[PDB]
Amino acid sequence: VYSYTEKKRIRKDFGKRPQVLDVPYLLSIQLDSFQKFIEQDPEGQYGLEAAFRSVFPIQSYSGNSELQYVSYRLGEPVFDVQECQIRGVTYSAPLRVKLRLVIYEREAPEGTVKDIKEQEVYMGEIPLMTDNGTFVINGTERVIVSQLHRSPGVFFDSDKGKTHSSGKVLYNARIIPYRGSWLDFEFDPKDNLFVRIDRRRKLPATIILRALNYTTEQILDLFFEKVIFEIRDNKLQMELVPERLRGETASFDIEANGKVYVEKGRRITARHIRQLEKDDVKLIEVPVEYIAGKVVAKDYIDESTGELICAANMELSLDLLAKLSQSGHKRIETLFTNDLDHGPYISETLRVDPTNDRLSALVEIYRMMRPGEPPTREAAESLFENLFFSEDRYDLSAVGRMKFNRSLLREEIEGSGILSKDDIIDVMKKLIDIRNGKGEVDDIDHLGNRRIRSVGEMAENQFRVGLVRVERAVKERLSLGDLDTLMPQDMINAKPISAAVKEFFGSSQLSQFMDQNNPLSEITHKRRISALGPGGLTRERAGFEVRDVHPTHYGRVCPIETPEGPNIGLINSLSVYAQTNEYGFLETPYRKVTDGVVTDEIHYLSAIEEGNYVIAQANSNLDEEGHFVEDLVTCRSKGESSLFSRDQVDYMDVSTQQVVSVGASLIPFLEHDDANRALMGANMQRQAVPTLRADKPLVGTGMERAVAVDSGVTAVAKRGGVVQYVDASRIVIKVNEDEMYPGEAGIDIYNLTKYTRSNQNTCINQMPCVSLGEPVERGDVLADGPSTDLGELALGQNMRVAFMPWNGYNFEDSILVSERVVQEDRFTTIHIQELACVSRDTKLGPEEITADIPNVGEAALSKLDESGIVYIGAEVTGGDILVGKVTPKGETQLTPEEKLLRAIFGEKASDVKDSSLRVPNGVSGTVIDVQVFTRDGVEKDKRALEIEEMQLKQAKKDLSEELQILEAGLFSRIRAVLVAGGVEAEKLDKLPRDRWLELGLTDEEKQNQLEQLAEQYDELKHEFEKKLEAKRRKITQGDDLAPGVLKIVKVYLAVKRRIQPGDKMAGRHGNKGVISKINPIEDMPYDENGTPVDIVLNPLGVPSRMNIGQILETHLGMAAKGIGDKINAMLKQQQEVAKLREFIQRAYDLGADVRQKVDLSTFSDEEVMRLAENLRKGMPIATPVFDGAKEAEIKELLKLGDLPTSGQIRLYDGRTGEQFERPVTVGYMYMLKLNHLVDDKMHARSTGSYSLVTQQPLGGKAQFGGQRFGEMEVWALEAYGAAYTLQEMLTVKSDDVNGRTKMYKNIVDGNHQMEPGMPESFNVLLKEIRSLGINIELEDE
Amino acid sequence: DGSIIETPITANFREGLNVLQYFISTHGARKGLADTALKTANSGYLTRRLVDVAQDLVVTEDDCGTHEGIMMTPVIEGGDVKEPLRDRVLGRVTAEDVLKPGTA
């Protein structure tokens, strides 16, 4: 039982495991983050509002003024997404802020206040966002990628053997802010405890204990328990608490309480404490091996004589022990020297430190930022304390204070975004204690310790700094004015926070052009996870911390949805089901136990909790009147794995695709592929492009309907009802009183895109999927887009595939395609691209634009406006004009024996340079839009003023339909309220509305329900009373183009980039390669059906690719498409309606190992038949990745294709009628054509552009350049001994103007020879060397 | 880290790979493909600097009078024949009147 639009389309899952949750709308790290950056939140600590709440009220340091605040705002837009391409200006609107001022009694003592003033002011701009989760910035969808960074606070790592005079093994503690300056704590090479304040040069770690204000025995009371000795009746003894054995380098042997405890060699590292606490020990007796090397902590004396024995900070010795044996005063306080037990590094570095007090421990820090400059007393304190407590220079958020307290095992759920001058003691304790195993490293790449920084967080981090670095003239001049008579505004500049926040989405370190190759690519782009920028590193200044994998990726971040090459792992994607808590820690869905079984009481849990509860793996299985057929439940934790009994479990995974991101989640057999080709599969589906006759993945996962809606590329019934109009750009519906809101007309609208540019110059368009009078439910599909088939995804097309080598072309994932593909105009792609021109501010003001280029290429001119511009709808190719930027030439010399021809005898008209904008040599396809723009006081040019009436026609018509569509709902509600008792109301739905006022209904309140609706009507339609002009003067709008430009012009091209060789293709399972010949339908193998095969791809390569999902998609596609081919034949003869039902139902009904069923007996014998059209493409299939339709199910379903259930068939050759020495792999694969496009990249050159800087060629397609014969390319000619071919590149084909201008013409000499003159790039260098100051010249031989 | 794991893949590509067998072997694949994409620089930069030192050996002359030479051998690591006389000697030239009794 399936919906009303599903009567056209239903997908067949095969999966096996107990999901009770499905796809969430994939875009949240854009969407919810954009909201919380720009939300009026009353008590939160994030976004624009929290940035202002961290700086304002600015109660001035001058004590005479205050710039107060109330809240942000956004409002007052003018551009919209259409103008944000057609014009191009970033889709943005002004940030404005509520500000105030207050002043007090200057003169009296009984009123306390005297003045109060408050307003709004401007404070910047903000880009704007679509329902589709996109943004539009300089003509293009430039979009922020989210970051995955070390969580702010502190970290604790271990440089366990780096380098230098002892390969130095280390442990550390290191500050990492959300915003700010720095501090590290570690050890020097010699092994003193050391520090790097702001990570500058070496300082002894006692300095900061003086700065934070602790004297020597306070440092002991903060970091050291204190060892105790005695001497009793006949022996030496020590005195204890039952944890004081934690590090001892035990050369020695001990008993305590009543058994042996320590023995010769067994170093008592803190692991050992679990020998002692259980045993209540408070006294021990030891060899002298633990009664020296223990530094006495006070002075001691001898009443046997009247004398001393030793002083504080002194050792013990056999003679001192002999005097202690006499003493009377038989006690000693002593220090821990055992390493990590307490770290003696403090005690000893307290005597390897020149600093003495807090002033020295701040003055020496001033030197560490200002060598050779006087340490200005008060600024020596500020320079250090403002590293951690400044208005501009430190923050953590509540998130980073939480991580700080968490990595220190605190209980304070209370604290500050700043540090404190005593929090630092615990950072130092952890370093003193860690360094051989009281603990270990802070679990860095745990995905609840590394943290997400979403789009709105990445914008927030700028406002946490810009408000405390740039406001200078405001912060200055606020001190000076008598603000009883001046205002909370009077010095605020407005230029910078426009561009600096508009283009934070268009030129920022994470805000690239979105991957608009096709819908799947933009859907995953919106949830990309960068490891880069402030919080990570780059591609270059980075190791494997930015590229590899750590097991907490499970359920959260798929390790294969990354670019390839050196870019590996630097940017990733969020798995389908994954999200984050209020700390940006990553989380996942789970099933959960009640009374004895893993119930359907589903939950979500953090990466940290995956390290704290027993999660069963997706393997496990339920039972009859019992519990589990899974006797030995396989389980998992932190990303690791185990085996347990039933009596031991808390949770389980909900699905397998919870471990998988969008591109990877469409690979139906990852059960059978290596990661190196799964990586390719996660990118080839993204490089794929819109095609003229698109067709669906027949094999599939289920994501083939989610990814059709996860960016709105298909329109969907957000309310639903009955379809009421349908048009190639427009759709409307009507609704009923079960939903219809308290005064509406009962309507929705679902209009559709048409032709514009994109970020990889792909085409954009949409088309309907419903018709007049169809009822549709709240989730039915209403339209299609650039990569769909009538209600599901189509990133490509299906083709028949032979997995065999052919006559040479297909060696290395390279692809043969049939002539039949060109006949059907298939894998032809469609593109929309833009080209432009200018007229500069001259001394008058304008510049010329026309078509005059006489006797230079006349046919490439025939296609133009009066203004020198092509027409919308005209075809253009290879060299046609687009915008008439002609330029006259000159030659001028013209003396009585130099007037050789023109200026007397012929062509006595212009010599205009071929400088007008033209179609590039290789481009072909229709002009689709044309524009002209100017400084606004000039109302717009004739070619834009005709296009005003081209755009006005659409709205002038549509609003004349809309007004009728609107009142045909609204007055139909009034008509219905009348029909409820005044049943004769069809005498009224045939009148002017004013004449309904001669009426009445019944002696009951329906009468007054009619009255109040008739009163309300004249207010309601004021909605319509604007509409047409609200598009018009966005076209006739002007914009300034900066001083230097009066006007700008554009043309757009629909480039029909056809199927051709050298272009690139792929399939879902990581097969990727060039189209390497087009083959006649018989120049190809044919099946046991007596029928040829559309594509051929080499299997000899496959064992080096280590992947087999490509074979399984091909074989399951042979069943899936074979169902549709058999339907095309069966629909003709029909045989019996129960025979149409036999095959069409059996295609769905055939299964044996499955959670789902398209049970077509739960659908009627015409729902069976409306579905048959979209089944002629083939049967659509589903399979959660790792839950899938394995080989045995393919070998069952193939009894619908009815071809050999081996998947390996007696192929023939169309040219010869032969049949090969063995059966061969065949089927039908889902395949793709990819935006590498050789079509765009035909770049050769005879001669062209030259770099004035060096007389050498320029380089670039965007420069028509010459290309680099590199140093390695020289090594080949050197190695060959090929000196003339090498010298050719070095002068007569490059910078030597003399050489290249003679060699070009040396064909006219007939003697095609070299005639070089001087390598100008060496002539350049001979004067650059002299411009540095080095003299250089020549000799002769 | 480069070292082996107690967690095998007892299956093969026709038997299949579960989520864990995929996920664990994907760590080794990421490491190997990241070294593939980086450790080339530790050979290409060295190759660039090598040619500056290597260039001048153009075959210019004929015998150079150097009546001395290296006592080369087959690659015999004491206890293998990893390269016979042929491959190492391949169109080099003698520097002594070499003679060995044995069979001819």
Is residue A913 helix, strand or coil? strand
CB contact under 8 A, B38 and A559: no
> Is the separation of the CB atoms in A839 and A1044 below 8 Å?
no
- Out of B16, B31, B55, the one facing A1190 most closely (by C-beta) is B16
Write phi, then psi, for A85 (nearest 5 degrees): -115, -55
Percentage helix, strand, coil, to 5, in chain B?
35, 0, 60
Stretch 24-63 of chain B: residues touching chain A, C-beta under 8 Å:
25-27, 29-31, 33-34, 37-38, 48, 51, 55, 58
CB-based contacts of B64: which residues, under 8 Å, 6+ apart?
none
CA distance, residue B76 to nearest chain A CA (Å): 32
Angle at the Cα of A861 from the Cα atoms of A859 and A865, rounded to 5 degrees:
140
What separation in angstroms does the CA of A697 have from each of A703, A705, A768, A813, B89?
10, 10, 20, 20, 60
Token pair of B45 as six digits: 């930069």
Q: How many CB pairs under 8 A join A and B?
A: 79
Token pair of A1326 as six digits: 């001979």
Element containing residue A793 per DSSP (H, E): strand A792-793
DSSP β-bridge partners for residue A789: A792
Alpha-carbon gap, residue A211 to A203, rounded angstroms: 13
Binding-site positions of B for Zn(2+) read: 64
Alpha-carbon gap, residue A380 to A362, rounded angstroms: 5
CB-based contacts of A460: which residues, under 8 Å, 6+ apart?
A37, A46, A47, A48, A50, A51
Token match 């340079």: residue? A913
| Resolution at which this structure was determined, Å | 17.0
Is residue A739 helix, strand or coil? coil
CA distance, residue A579 to nearest chain B CA (Å): 20
Token pair of A1063 as six digits: 């272009």
The gap from C-alpha A453 to its chain's centroid, in whole angstroms, comes to 11
Alpha-carbon gap, residue A1221 to A1210, rounded angstroms: 9
Q: What is the largest CA-CA distance in chain A?
A: 135
- Out of B14, B25, B51, the one facing A1275 most closely (by C-beta) is B51
CA distance, residue A656 to nearest chain B CA (Å): 7
CB-based contacts of A561: which residues, under 8 Å, 6+ apart?
A524, A572, A573, A661, A662, A663, A664, A682
> Is the separation of the CB atoms in A200 and A368 below 8 Å?
yes
> Is the separation of the CB atoms in A303 and A279 below 8 Å?
no
> Cα dihedral sign for A603, A605, A609, A610?
positive
- Out of A617, A641, A676, the one facing B29 most closely (by C-beta) is A676
Alpha-carbon gap, residue A289 to A310, rounded angstroms: 19
CB-based contacts of A685: which residues, under 8 Å, 6+ apart?
A520, A521, A663, A666, A795, A1066, A1068, A1232
Buried b (16+ CB within 10 A) or exposed e, A1294-1318: bbbebbbebbeeeeeeeeeeebbee
Is residue A439 helix, strand or coil? coil
Alpha-carbon gap, residue A1020 to A743, rounded angstroms: 9
Token match 């946490």: residue? A464
Alpha-carbon gap, residue A536 to A986, rounded angstroms: 72
Strands (E), A610-730: 615-616, 634-637, 640-643, 651-653, 721-726
Nearest Cα to A660, choosing from A546, A540, A775, A574?
A: A574
Nearest residue in B to A1103, CA atom:
B13
CB contact under 8 A, B23 and A674: no
Alpha-carbon gap, residue A140 to A670, rounded angstroms: 35
CB contact under 8 A, A569 and B51: no
- B51 CB neighbours in chain A (<8 A) are 1271, 1275
Alpha-carbon gap, residue A855 to A507, rounded angstroms: 44
Q: Rounding to the nearest 10 degrees, give the CA dihedral for residues A10, A13, A19, A25.
A: -50
Please state whether beta strands A797-802 and A1095-1097 pair in parallel, antiparallel, or not at all (unpaired): parallel
- A1106 CB neighbours in chain B (<8 A) are 13
The reply to whether A544 touches chain B by the CB within 8 Å rule is yes
Alpha-carbon gap, residue A508 to A1251, rounded angstroms: 30
Alpha-carbon gap, residue A398 to A405, rounded angstroms: 10
Buried b (16+ CB within 10 A) or exposed e, A322-340: ebbeebeeeebbbbbbbbb
- A618 CB neighbours in chain B (<8 A) are 19
Picking from A671, A1102, A1107, A1286 by the largest number of B CB atoms within 10 A of its own CB, the best residue to mutate is A671
Is residue A600 helix, strand or coil? strand
Write phi, then psi, for A237 (nearest 5 degrees): -145, 165
| DSSP conformation letters of B61-95 | -S-TT---------B--SS--SB-HHHHHTT---S
Nearest Cα to A1177, choosing from A1120, A1229, A1253?
A: A1120
> Is the separation of the CB atoms in A36 and A458 below 8 Å?
no
DSSP β-bridge partners for residue A453: A147
> Is the separation of the CB atoms in A307 and A299 below 8 Å?
no
- A547 CB neighbours in chain B (<8 A) are 30, 34
